[PDB]
Amino acid sequence: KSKAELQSEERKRIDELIESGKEEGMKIDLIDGKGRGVIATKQFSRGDFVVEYHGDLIEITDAKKREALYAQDPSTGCYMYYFQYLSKTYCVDATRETNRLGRLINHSKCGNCQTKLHDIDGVPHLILIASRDIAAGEELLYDYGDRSKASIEAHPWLKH
Amino acid sequence: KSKAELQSEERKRIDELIESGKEEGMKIDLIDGKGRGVIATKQFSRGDFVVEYHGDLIEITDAKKREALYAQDPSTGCYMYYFQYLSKTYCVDATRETNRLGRLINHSKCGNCQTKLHDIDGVPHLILIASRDIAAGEELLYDYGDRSKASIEAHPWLKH
């Protein structure tokens, strides 16, 4: 196979994992001190697709509007994921409770998933890929990336 | 006051601010297409000290070592600030996430801050000085100075 063939085959597999949204190999569990979380039910090898961070894709100015509204109700929870694409800032707003699992994955600075941008026909998606081999039963975790002094004061678990 | 007197008074203000690490009149905001930026929360006057570009002060061998390592990890950002001092290359490497704000200031060729080398008894510091009056609410910006073809190809926002 050529490089072009290998690339297109890879792109199609990831596109199809995203589009089908089956979210295999994961289950919700209660995690001590963290609320709900997501545990692996199968092995993931380093580099493997884990799950999309799926929710409502919005642009930055609407995201800022929603933040201010959500802040009115301390019970809301924090499910908004900011990122850059083609010189603009976007947000996957996963506040609404759905059956999707990416929004339920907890934070660690020594996690086992890494978030990547994957675009499909000019539409950006955030996907989590395994950053090491993950054993069945491990909690899926990634770095939320929020380092702001204010967030850390309010959410001290962000420190680790 | 004489020029010398005004220079000594300015040096003293600057030394005090470098000592205290006080970073007043600024906050972090998300800026569309840039990630984080730093915005003024008060008016700054032309000539005012704004912030130190604060990080790990290193020499060239360590800077090159670190560059080579950073280049292997695409998730690592670009926070290395190079300058000449006493016929040698130095670098303020602000890659590590800290609460210091200079590292978060974005680029423009027509910004509102200018970086200066400020020597305190043989220790070099990079400081940002307001190049014009800065309005409350506007983003702090300075010229990153990397005009290389190799950088602008990958980071076209460097061109403006």
Binding site: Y82, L126, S151, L158 | -
Partner: peptide, 9 residues
């Protein structure tokens, strides 16, 4: 206060 989730770079 609310925190966020953010992808850097």
């Amino acid at each position: 206060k609310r925190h966020r989730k953010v992808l850097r770079d």
